[PDB]
Amino acid sequence: IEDYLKGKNCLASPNYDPDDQHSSWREDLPQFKKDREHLTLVNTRRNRTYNTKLNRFDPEYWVVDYNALMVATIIPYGSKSFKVPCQWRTNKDFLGVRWMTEDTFDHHLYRYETDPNYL
Amino acid sequence: MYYIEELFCRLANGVLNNTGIVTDDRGDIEDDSKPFIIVAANEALTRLHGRFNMRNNNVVVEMQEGRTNYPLLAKYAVQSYDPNEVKCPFIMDLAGEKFAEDVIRILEVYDDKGRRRPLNDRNNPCSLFTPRPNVLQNNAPKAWEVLNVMYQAKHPKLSTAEDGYNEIDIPDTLDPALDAYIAYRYYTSLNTPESSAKAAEYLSFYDSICREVVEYDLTSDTEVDTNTLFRKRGWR
Amino acid sequence: MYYIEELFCRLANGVLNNTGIVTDDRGDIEDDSKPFIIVAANEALTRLHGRFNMRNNNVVVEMQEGRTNYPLLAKYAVQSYDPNEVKCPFIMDLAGEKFAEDVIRILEVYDDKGRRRPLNDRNNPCSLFTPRPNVLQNNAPKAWEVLNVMYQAKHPKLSTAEDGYNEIDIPDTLDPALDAYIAYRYYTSLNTPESSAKAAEYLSFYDSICREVVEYDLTSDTEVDTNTLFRKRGWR
Amino acid sequence: MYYIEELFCRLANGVLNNTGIVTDDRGDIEDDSKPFIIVAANEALTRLHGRFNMRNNNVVVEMQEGRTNYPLLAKYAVQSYDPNEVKCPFIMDLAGEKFAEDVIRILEVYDDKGRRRPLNDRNNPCSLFTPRPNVLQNNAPKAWEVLNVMYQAKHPKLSTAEDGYNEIDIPDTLDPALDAYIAYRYYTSLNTPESSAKAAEYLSFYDSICREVVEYDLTSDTEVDTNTLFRKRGWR
Amino acid sequence: PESEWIFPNYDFVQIEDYDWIIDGRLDLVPLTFDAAVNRLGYPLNVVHYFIGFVLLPEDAKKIWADVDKAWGLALEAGIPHIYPWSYTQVMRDGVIYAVPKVCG
Amino acid sequence: SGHTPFNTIPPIVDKMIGNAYYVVKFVALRMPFIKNVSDNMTQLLAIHNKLTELSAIYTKLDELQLIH
Amino acid sequence: TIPNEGYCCETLNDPIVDKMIGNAYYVVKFVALRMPFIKNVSDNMTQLLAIHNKLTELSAIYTKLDELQLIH
Amino acid sequence: ETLNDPIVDKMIGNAYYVVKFVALRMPFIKNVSDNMTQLLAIHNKLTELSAIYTKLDELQLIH
Amino acid sequence: TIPNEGYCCETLNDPIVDKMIGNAYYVVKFVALRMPFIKNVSDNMTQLLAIHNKLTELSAIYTKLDELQLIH
Amino acid sequence: ETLNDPIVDKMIGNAYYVVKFVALRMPFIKNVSDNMTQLLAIHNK
């Protein structure tokens, strides 16, 4: 801000651009814009139109849920196939591989259309 | 003298209580429409500062040789300027608030020697000129000439962004006029005949308040002084 | 004088008797709708104290060396200043009479030695100036110079908080005017055309009450004094 | 001064807030509809600079032997002339201040020796003539005669191209007038009767703003000078 | 044990300011940047910073508001690598990076 | 409303030119004395760091010099 | 032979000029431009006061300073 | 009488307090300022004087 | 040398009154600033009256303070 | 007095600082141009 204290403000300087010679009458703004692009949240009031088609029951969107006493993960390995390795530790272990009608994990800009009609 | 946050609360619990631009609890305005109020608020404050001479501010300009036009812009001040662009700023605000670029009309100019420089006098050889309202022109910059400019100043621009100006400084008797003007812009933007009639009423109310202030002179706008021409003309 | 609760009862059993913001027993306004009335009530009081010179209050300002502008803000009062950023306050008040920034228009200024000080006299070197309505400027601060400023004052701002003011001190003949303005603000908020017609009636009624007071001079607004120019002009 | 993008935001969050040509986030006008605003914006600026003498700019013209008519066109400027068909330019400007043909009305002409040259004086043999508003005619081109022309100038034409101008330099008190005229042009384009009524309101509002500026003289339009005829008439 | 966690004992350093951002204590944020270069001795080019912590969805727009302010200080401080703390909280709240509107 | 600062030209404690201005002129005319001390602030601080030790050496006037 | 004076060219810690002592703005600008020098002395006034109180003690050490070197 | 006070307020303002503080104690600074060469001659050998202070106990026995 | 006066600075309840008796505001501000000193005496006026009632009683014993120490 | 400043600003403007920069060191340029041929002779061989 107050760099004027350090001095070095003499008008006599060798740097000069002949392509931008101007008088005191000309005043213009530089082209620099978009300084910070601050972080912000999305607006849920507007619903952005979907721009791509997702095949139903796509293997890349399945999710899993199970009891806290076991360990299981889901990994795809093909165009229409996936594997679910798991470890069983108790008799009450219950692994559930499920497909969600609505999107509740992806970003608001990456969610898919919700449709409860599977007829 | 209150912050910008109270303005939103006052509008939410005021003229704009019925509309849907306020939150569910009528405590604040939606973030999606906050800049809409800011644009109206900046417009309303400019109108009030034009009709009334509420604020008077002065700046210090240092003459630089080879330059005849001295725009009163923020980028030429000693504060908030780019050292890479302008090598030596000529507007000094070393103390107090920074120069907010709020020039409307130049009133008088006094130099460092203590005399008064005539302004816009075409027949005066040593008079200054204003080719533009916010641009001051000197036709003979001297070595150590420094000019002080007294001008009618508007309120600094308000902004909800970080490190912006978020304080309102107007006389409290003009608060109803501010609310009426903001409401006028909001309702007239709906393009609805029901809302258009309501918008016209608010505009008339805003004008009614302003003329009431002038009628009773609550801003001390008028100014008189002891006559000095009596001795100047030699009446004795 | 009466509590703000009595105002709520009077509005509940008054103009707002047929509104949905009152309690089932018509004894009080709805709690969530109380801030709406408070904002309108403060606005109504400001207008009344502007047209009518009802309250005349004075403040004491101490000149400080090296300072010319003396804003009349509570942050410079001895009872409310913050020592972190303020070296020493210059506005003097009492613990039970804290300065509330109720300045509307400056009337006269007297120094500690009893001499009247001219205001806004551009041709008088010793005169004081007011660049802003609530800012006092002295161009020559002396050592022990103390200034007293007498001004027209607004009613202190009401607040529902316990520490804030909760009383109203206005002439009882203006109570219908206060109720009419509050009713006008409420009915104007509703955008139904039927309410718009009702809102205009209260505003017209409010104006009629104000002119009736002026016509009969019930607030002793008119003031006269014995002639002194007869001696000064030397008519003898 | 501000970028044209800020104008787009101000229109998006202003009069055009309820239009179909704004983005979903109300942050900018639709790209395909941008040239519509640009054409209207340039038209609005021309009207403002005509009623109000805001910008006074001067140009330098060099007399060429064998030429009497000197059109004030950019094709005769040194920075924009084509050597194929122009032997030598006579309008002198700088690389960063290229002549933009912003001439509206000629005010005064001074030669290189400092003598005022009368304009359109039919009875004066040495007077200059203007057969066209933007064409200067000299009936006696001398050897080293150079003329300076000071004229009322319009704002440079805006353009969405990068090389073109992208900034607005007008008094901030006229911003509502600029928005009103643009709004009037947009709503007038729509042929629905409801939009026609709305269009007239903005045009009337635009006229009201302009007269308010004239009434208070916020642009220093009025100009006076010391009397000189008293000496010339020999009153003494 | 500060005597064991000096710069030569590790290749780079990671720090967080979750406690000072839950409250409006933005004044203590630059102290973290200061302590990375002198208190610990690590150079600037090996400093990794985690911005903030949100947890409850109800405080998203409140906490993330202070998150952006801390990021600006980090950019001013010249931190080479800056990450948000939680991938889950980013997707749960849906935070984006957009230029603030020039309207005001 | 408002007085231009540069329009300066229209008993014991008070001054004709202004109490605030007289102090500024007083400091300005003695600026090099202030700058000389300011430029050597670190040197003075170093002496002030152990200024007690130098005093103790000083207090022994004759003993420290008779040996030489 | 050509003029070179000016505030921009004078913007450095240099001795004041006696030509424009009577210029009211110049005197105020001179002090305001050199505020850090005033600030640097003011904020550590306590240290200087103790040193000022012991001027004679330091002078005596300097008088026989060269003798003290040979003692070491 | 000259109204030079507003110039000080415009250019210095709230920073006037430190100027007044230094102005009051000007003679104290002047005594330090004109004796700078004395302190500088001591500044270049602080370590030597400190070392002498740490071995002066033997001199009491010698004396 | 330079002036040093004022109300905000160089004024406290501990220093003594100045020569500016004529200024009505000064004396009123003088007492108002030193209000707690007056309050401390006022609310404890009962104790002072009892002590003053035996003022000569404590004067006589004061005459033989050293002699009473012999017994102890 | 004569008001020749506007002509310089209108025709040179931003480039005036270059003129001042060179003019401030005219004698240095003067002491070289006068004996230019000596430098050329050295540069010849």
CSV table of N, CA and C in Angstrom, one decimal, chain D residues 67-183:
chain,number,residue,atom,x,y,z
D,67,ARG,N,-4.9,21.9,-50.4
D,67,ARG,CA,-6.1,21.3,-49.8
D,67,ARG,C,-6.8,22.3,-49.0
D,68,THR,N,-8.1,22.5,-49.2
D,68,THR,CA,-8.9,23.4,-48.4
D,68,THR,C,-9.9,22.7,-47.5
D,69,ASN,N,-10.5,21.6,-47.8
D,69,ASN,CA,-11.3,20.8,-47.0
D,69,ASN,C,-10.5,19.8,-46.2
D,70,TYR,N,-10.8,19.8,-44.9
D,70,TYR,CA,-10.0,18.9,-44.0
D,70,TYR,C,-11.0,18.1,-43.2
D,71,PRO,N,-11.5,17.0,-43.7
D,71,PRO,CA,-12.5,16.1,-42.9
D,71,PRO,C,-11.8,15.6,-41.7
D,72,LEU,N,-12.5,15.5,-40.6
D,72,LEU,CA,-12.0,14.9,-39.3
D,72,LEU,C,-12.3,13.5,-39.2
D,73,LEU,N,-11.7,12.7,-40.1
D,73,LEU,CA,-11.9,11.2,-40.2
D,73,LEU,C,-10.6,10.5,-39.8
D,74,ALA,N,-10.7,9.3,-39.2
D,74,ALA,CA,-9.6,8.5,-38.8
D,74,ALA,C,-8.7,8.1,-39.9
D,75,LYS,N,-9.2,8.0,-41.2
D,75,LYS,CA,-8.4,7.6,-42.3
D,75,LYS,C,-7.3,8.7,-42.7
D,76,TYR,N,-7.5,9.9,-42.2
D,76,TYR,CA,-6.5,10.9,-42.4
D,76,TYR,C,-5.5,11.1,-41.1
D,77,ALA,N,-5.7,10.2,-40.1
D,77,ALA,CA,-4.8,10.3,-39.0
D,77,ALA,C,-3.5,9.6,-39.3
D,78,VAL,N,-2.4,10.1,-38.6
D,78,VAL,CA,-1.1,9.5,-38.8
D,78,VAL,C,-1.0,8.0,-38.4
D,79,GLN,N,-1.8,7.7,-37.4
D,79,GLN,CA,-1.8,6.3,-36.8
D,79,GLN,C,-2.7,5.4,-37.5
D,80,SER,N,-3.5,5.8,-38.5
D,80,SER,CA,-4.5,5.0,-39.1
D,80,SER,C,-4.6,5.2,-40.6
D,81,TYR,N,-3.8,6.1,-41.2
D,81,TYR,CA,-3.9,6.3,-42.7
D,81,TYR,C,-3.3,5.2,-43.5
D,82,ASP,N,-3.8,5.0,-44.7
D,82,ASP,CA,-3.3,4.0,-45.6
D,82,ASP,C,-2.4,4.7,-46.6
D,83,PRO,N,-1.1,4.4,-46.6
D,83,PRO,CA,-0.2,5.1,-47.6
D,83,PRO,C,-0.6,4.9,-49.1
D,84,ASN,N,-1.4,3.8,-49.4
D,84,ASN,CA,-1.7,3.5,-50.7
D,84,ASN,C,-2.4,4.6,-51.4
D,85,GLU,N,-3.4,5.2,-50.7
D,85,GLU,CA,-4.2,6.2,-51.3
D,85,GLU,C,-4.1,7.6,-50.7
D,86,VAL,N,-3.4,7.7,-49.5
D,86,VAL,CA,-3.2,9.0,-48.8
D,86,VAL,C,-1.7,9.3,-49.0
D,87,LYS,N,-1.4,10.5,-49.6
D,87,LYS,CA,0.0,10.9,-49.7
D,87,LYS,C,0.6,11.1,-48.4
D,88,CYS,N,-0.1,11.9,-47.5
D,88,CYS,CA,0.4,12.1,-46.2
D,88,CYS,C,-0.7,12.6,-45.2
D,89,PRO,N,-0.8,12.0,-44.0
D,89,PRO,CA,-1.8,12.4,-43.1
D,89,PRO,C,-1.6,13.8,-42.6
D,90,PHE,N,-2.7,14.5,-42.2
D,90,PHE,CA,-2.6,15.8,-41.6
D,90,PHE,C,-3.2,15.9,-40.2
D,91,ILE,N,-3.9,14.9,-39.7
D,91,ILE,CA,-4.3,14.8,-38.3
D,91,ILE,C,-3.3,14.0,-37.5
D,92,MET,N,-2.8,14.7,-36.4
D,92,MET,CA,-1.7,14.2,-35.6
D,92,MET,C,-2.3,13.7,-34.3
D,93,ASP,N,-1.9,12.4,-34.0
D,93,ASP,CA,-2.3,11.8,-32.7
D,93,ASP,C,-1.2,10.9,-32.3
D,94,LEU,N,-1.4,10.2,-31.1
D,94,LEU,CA,-0.4,9.3,-30.6
D,94,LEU,C,-0.9,7.9,-30.7
D,95,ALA,N,0.1,6.9,-30.5
D,95,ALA,CA,-0.2,5.5,-30.7
D,95,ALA,C,-1.2,5.0,-29.7
D,96,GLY,N,-1.1,5.5,-28.4
D,96,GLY,CA,-2.1,5.1,-27.4
D,96,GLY,C,-3.3,6.0,-27.3
D,97,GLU,N,-3.4,7.0,-28.2
D,97,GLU,CA,-4.5,8.0,-28.2
D,97,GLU,C,-5.0,8.2,-29.6
D,98,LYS,N,-5.2,7.1,-30.3
D,98,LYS,CA,-5.6,7.2,-31.7
D,98,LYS,C,-6.9,8.0,-31.8
D,99,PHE,N,-7.0,8.8,-32.9
D,99,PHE,CA,-8.2,9.6,-33.1
D,99,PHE,C,-9.4,8.6,-33.4
D,100,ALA,N,-10.5,8.9,-32.8
D,100,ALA,CA,-11.7,8.0,-32.9
D,100,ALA,C,-12.9,8.7,-33.5
D,101,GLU,N,-12.7,9.8,-34.2
D,101,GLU,CA,-13.8,10.5,-34.8
D,101,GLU,C,-15.0,10.8,-33.9
D,102,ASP,N,-14.6,11.3,-32.7
D,102,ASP,CA,-15.6,11.6,-31.7
D,102,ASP,C,-16.1,13.1,-31.7
D,103,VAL,N,-16.0,13.7,-32.8
D,103,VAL,CA,-16.3,15.1,-32.9
D,103,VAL,C,-17.9,15.3,-33.0
D,104,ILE,N,-18.4,16.2,-32.1
D,104,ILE,CA,-19.8,16.5,-32.1
D,104,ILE,C,-20.0,17.9,-32.6
D,105,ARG,N,-19.4,18.9,-31.9
D,105,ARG,CA,-19.6,20.3,-32.2
D,105,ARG,C,-18.3,21.1,-32.0
D,106,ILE,N,-17.8,21.8,-33.0
D,106,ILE,CA,-16.6,22.6,-32.9
D,106,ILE,C,-16.9,23.8,-32.0
D,107,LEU,N,-16.0,24.1,-31.0
D,107,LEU,CA,-16.1,25.2,-30.1
D,107,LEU,C,-15.2,26.4,-30.5
D,108,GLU,N,-13.9,26.2,-30.6
D,108,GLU,CA,-13.0,27.2,-30.9
D,108,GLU,C,-11.8,26.6,-31.6
D,109,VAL,N,-11.1,27.5,-32.4
D,109,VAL,CA,-9.9,27.1,-33.2
D,109,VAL,C,-8.8,28.1,-32.9
D,110,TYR,N,-7.6,27.6,-32.6
D,110,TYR,CA,-6.5,28.5,-32.4
D,110,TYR,C,-5.3,28.0,-33.3
D,111,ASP,N,-4.6,28.9,-33.9
D,111,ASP,CA,-3.5,28.5,-34.8
D,111,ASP,C,-2.2,28.3,-33.9
D,112,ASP,N,-1.1,28.0,-34.6
D,112,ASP,CA,0.1,27.7,-33.9
D,112,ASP,C,0.7,28.9,-33.3
D,113,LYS,N,0.3,30.1,-33.7
D,113,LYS,CA,0.9,31.4,-33.2
D,113,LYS,C,0.0,31.9,-32.1
D,114,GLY,N,-1.1,31.3,-31.7
D,114,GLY,CA,-1.9,31.7,-30.5
D,114,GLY,C,-3.0,32.7,-30.8
D,115,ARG,N,-3.4,32.8,-32.1
D,115,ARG,CA,-4.4,33.8,-32.4
D,115,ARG,C,-5.8,33.0,-32.6
D,116,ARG,N,-6.8,33.5,-32.0
D,116,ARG,CA,-8.1,32.9,-32.2
D,116,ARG,C,-8.6,33.1,-33.6
D,117,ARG,N,-9.2,32.1,-34.2
D,117,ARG,CA,-9.7,32.1,-35.6
D,117,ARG,C,-11.2,32.1,-35.6
D,118,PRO,N,-11.9,33.1,-36.1
D,118,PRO,CA,-13.3,33.1,-36.1
D,118,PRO,C,-13.9,32.0,-37.0
D,119,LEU,N,-15.0,31.5,-36.7
D,119,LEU,CA,-15.6,30.4,-37.4
D,119,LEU,C,-17.0,30.8,-37.9
D,120,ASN,N,-17.3,30.5,-39.2
D,120,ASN,CA,-18.6,30.7,-39.8
D,120,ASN,C,-18.9,32.2,-39.8
D,121,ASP,N,-17.9,33.1,-40.0
D,121,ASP,CA,-18.1,34.5,-40.1
D,121,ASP,C,-18.0,34.9,-41.5
D,122,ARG,N,-19.2,35.0,-42.2
D,122,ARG,CA,-19.2,35.2,-43.6
D,122,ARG,C,-18.6,36.5,-44.0
D,123,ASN,N,-18.7,37.6,-43.2
D,123,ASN,CA,-18.2,38.9,-43.6
D,123,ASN,C,-16.7,39.0,-43.3
D,124,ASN,N,-16.1,38.0,-42.6
D,124,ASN,CA,-14.7,38.1,-42.3
D,124,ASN,C,-13.9,37.3,-43.3
D,125,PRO,N,-13.0,37.9,-44.1
D,125,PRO,CA,-12.3,37.2,-45.1
D,125,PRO,C,-11.4,36.1,-44.5
D,126,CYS,N,-10.8,36.3,-43.3
D,126,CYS,CA,-9.9,35.4,-42.8
D,126,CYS,C,-10.5,34.3,-41.9
D,127,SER,N,-11.9,34.4,-41.8
D,127,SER,CA,-12.6,33.4,-41.0
D,127,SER,C,-12.6,32.0,-41.6
D,128,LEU,N,-12.8,31.0,-40.8
D,128,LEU,CA,-12.9,29.6,-41.3
D,128,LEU,C,-14.4,29.3,-41.5
D,129,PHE,N,-14.6,28.2,-42.2
D,129,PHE,CA,-16.0,27.7,-42.5
D,129,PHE,C,-16.1,26.2,-42.3
D,130,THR,N,-17.3,25.8,-42.0
D,130,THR,CA,-17.6,24.4,-41.8
D,130,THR,C,-18.8,24.0,-42.6
D,131,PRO,N,-18.5,23.6,-43.9
D,131,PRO,CA,-19.6,23.1,-44.7
D,131,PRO,C,-20.3,21.9,-44.2
D,132,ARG,N,-19.6,21.1,-43.4
D,132,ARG,CA,-20.2,19.9,-42.7
D,132,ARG,C,-19.8,20.0,-41.3
D,133,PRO,N,-20.7,19.4,-40.4
D,133,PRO,CA,-20.4,19.4,-39.0
D,133,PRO,C,-19.0,18.8,-38.6
D,134,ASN,N,-18.5,17.8,-39.3
D,134,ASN,CA,-17.3,17.2,-39.0
D,134,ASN,C,-16.2,17.5,-40.1
D,135,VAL,N,-16.4,18.5,-40.9
D,135,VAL,CA,-15.4,18.9,-41.9
D,135,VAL,C,-15.0,20.3,-41.6
D,136,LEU,N,-13.7,20.6,-41.6
D,136,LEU,CA,-13.1,21.9,-41.4
D,136,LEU,C,-12.5,22.4,-42.7
D,137,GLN,N,-12.9,23.6,-43.1
D,137,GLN,CA,-12.4,24.2,-44.4
D,137,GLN,C,-11.6,25.4,-44.1
D,138,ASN,N,-10.4,25.5,-44.7
D,138,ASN,CA,-9.6,26.7,-44.7
D,138,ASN,C,-9.4,27.2,-46.1
D,139,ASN,N,-9.6,28.5,-46.3
D,139,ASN,CA,-9.6,29.0,-47.6
D,139,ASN,C,-8.2,29.6,-48.0
D,140,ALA,N,-7.2,29.6,-47.1
D,140,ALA,CA,-5.9,30.1,-47.4
D,140,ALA,C,-4.9,29.3,-46.6
D,141,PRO,N,-4.5,28.1,-47.1
D,141,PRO,CA,-3.4,27.3,-46.4
D,141,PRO,C,-2.1,28.0,-46.6
D,142,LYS,N,-1.4,28.3,-45.5
D,142,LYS,CA,-0.1,28.9,-45.6
D,142,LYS,C,1.0,27.8,-45.5
D,143,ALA,N,2.2,28.2,-45.3
D,143,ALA,CA,3.4,27.3,-45.4
D,143,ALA,C,3.4,26.4,-44.1
D,144,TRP,N,3.6,27.1,-43.0
D,144,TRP,CA,3.7,26.4,-41.7
D,144,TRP,C,2.5,26.5,-40.8
D,145,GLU,N,1.4,26.7,-41.4
D,145,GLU,CA,0.2,27.0,-40.6
D,145,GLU,C,-0.3,25.7,-40.0
D,146,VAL,N,-0.5,25.6,-38.7
D,146,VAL,CA,-1.0,24.5,-37.9
D,146,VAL,C,-2.1,25.0,-37.1
D,147,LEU,N,-3.3,24.2,-37.1
D,147,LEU,CA,-4.5,24.6,-36.4
D,147,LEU,C,-4.8,23.6,-35.3
D,148,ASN,N,-5.3,24.1,-34.2
D,148,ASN,CA,-5.8,23.3,-33.1
D,148,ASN,C,-7.2,23.5,-32.9
D,149,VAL,N,-8.0,22.5,-32.9
D,149,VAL,CA,-9.5,22.5,-32.9
D,149,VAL,C,-9.9,21.9,-31.5
D,150,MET,N,-10.6,22.7,-30.7
D,150,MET,CA,-11.2,22.2,-29.5
D,150,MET,C,-12.7,22.1,-29.7
D,151,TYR,N,-13.2,20.9,-29.3
D,151,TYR,CA,-14.6,20.6,-29.6
D,151,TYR,C,-15.2,19.8,-28.5
D,152,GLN,N,-16.5,19.8,-28.4
D,152,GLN,CA,-17.2,18.9,-27.6
D,152,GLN,C,-17.2,17.5,-28.2
D,153,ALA,N,-16.8,16.5,-27.3
D,153,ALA,CA,-16.5,15.1,-27.8
D,153,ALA,C,-17.5,14.1,-27.2
D,154,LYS,N,-17.8,13.1,-27.9
D,154,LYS,CA,-18.6,12.0,-27.4
D,154,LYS,C,-17.7,11.0,-26.8
D,155,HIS,N,-18.4,10.1,-26.0
D,155,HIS,CA,-17.6,8.9,-25.5
D,155,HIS,C,-17.2,8.0,-26.6
D,156,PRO,N,-16.0,7.4,-26.5
D,156,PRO,CA,-15.6,6.5,-27.6
D,156,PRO,C,-16.5,5.3,-27.6
D,157,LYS,N,-16.7,4.8,-28.9
D,157,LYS,CA,-17.7,3.7,-29.1
D,157,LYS,C,-17.2,2.5,-28.5
D,158,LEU,N,-18.1,1.8,-27.7
D,158,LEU,CA,-17.7,0.5,-27.1
D,158,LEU,C,-17.7,-0.6,-28.1
D,159,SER,N,-16.9,-1.6,-27.8
D,159,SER,CA,-16.9,-2.8,-28.7
D,159,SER,C,-16.5,-4.0,-27.8
D,160,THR,N,-17.1,-5.2,-28.1
D,160,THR,CA,-16.8,-6.4,-27.4
D,160,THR,C,-15.4,-7.0,-27.8
D,161,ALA,N,-14.8,-6.5,-28.9
D,161,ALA,CA,-13.5,-7.0,-29.4
D,161,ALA,C,-12.5,-6.6,-28.4
D,162,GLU,N,-11.4,-7.4,-28.3
D,162,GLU,CA,-10.3,-7.1,-27.3
D,162,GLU,C,-9.6,-5.8,-27.6
D,163,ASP,N,-9.3,-5.5,-28.9
D,163,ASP,CA,-8.6,-4.3,-29.3
D,163,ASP,C,-9.5,-3.1,-29.1
D,164,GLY,N,-10.8,-3.2,-29.1
D,164,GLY,CA,-11.6,-2.1,-28.9
D,164,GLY,C,-11.8,-1.6,-27.5
D,165,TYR,N,-12.4,-0.4,-27.3
D,165,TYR,CA,-12.6,0.1,-26.0
D,165,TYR,C,-13.5,-0.7,-25.2
D,166,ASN,N,-13.2,-0.9,-23.9
D,166,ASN,CA,-14.0,-1.7,-23.0
D,166,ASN,C,-14.2,-1.0,-21.6
D,167,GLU,N,-14.2,0.3,-21.6
D,167,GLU,CA,-14.4,1.0,-20.4
D,167,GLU,C,-15.3,2.2,-20.6
D,168,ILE,N,-16.0,2.6,-19.5
D,168,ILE,CA,-17.0,3.7,-19.5
D,168,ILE,C,-16.5,4.8,-18.6
D,169,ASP,N,-16.4,6.0,-19.1
D,169,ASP,CA,-16.0,7.2,-18.3
D,169,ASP,C,-17.1,8.2,-18.3
D,170,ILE,N,-18.1,8.1,-17.4
D,170,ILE,CA,-19.1,9.1,-17.3
D,170,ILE,C,-19.3,9.4,-15.8
D,171,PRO,N,-19.9,10.5,-15.5
D,171,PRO,CA,-20.2,10.8,-14.1
D,171,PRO,C,-21.1,9.8,-13.5
D,172,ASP,N,-20.8,9.4,-12.3
D,172,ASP,CA,-21.6,8.3,-11.7
D,172,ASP,C,-23.0,8.7,-11.3
D,173,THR,N,-23.3,10.0,-11.3
D,173,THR,CA,-24.6,10.4,-11.0
D,173,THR,C,-25.6,10.2,-12.2
D,174,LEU,N,-25.0,9.9,-13.4
D,174,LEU,CA,-25.8,9.7,-14.6
D,174,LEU,C,-26.0,8.2,-14.8
D,175,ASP,N,-25.5,7.3,-14.0
D,175,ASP,CA,-25.7,5.9,-14.2
D,175,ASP,C,-27.1,5.4,-14.2
D,176,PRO,N,-28.0,5.9,-13.3
D,176,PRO,CA,-29.4,5.5,-13.5
D,176,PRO,C,-30.0,6.0,-14.8
D,177,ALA,N,-29.6,7.2,-15.3
D,177,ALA,CA,-30.0,7.6,-16.7
D,177,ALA,C,-29.6,6.7,-17.8
D,178,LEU,N,-28.3,6.2,-17.7
D,178,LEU,CA,-27.9,5.2,-18.7
D,178,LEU,C,-28.7,3.9,-18.6
D,179,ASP,N,-28.9,3.4,-17.4
D,179,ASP,CA,-29.7,2.2,-17.3
D,179,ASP,C,-31.1,2.4,-17.8
D,180,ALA,N,-31.7,3.5,-17.5
D,180,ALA,CA,-33.1,3.7,-17.9
D,180,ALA,C,-33.3,3.7,-19.4
D,181,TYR,N,-32.3,4.4,-20.1
D,181,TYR,CA,-32.4,4.4,-21.6
D,181,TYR,C,-32.2,3.1,-22.2
D,182,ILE,N,-31.3,2.3,-21.7
D,182,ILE,CA,-31.1,0.9,-22.1
D,182,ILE,C,-32.4,0.1,-21.9
D,183,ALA,N,-32.9,0.2,-20.7
D,183,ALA,CA,-34.2,-0.5,-20.4
D,183,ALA,C,-35.3,-0.1,-21.3
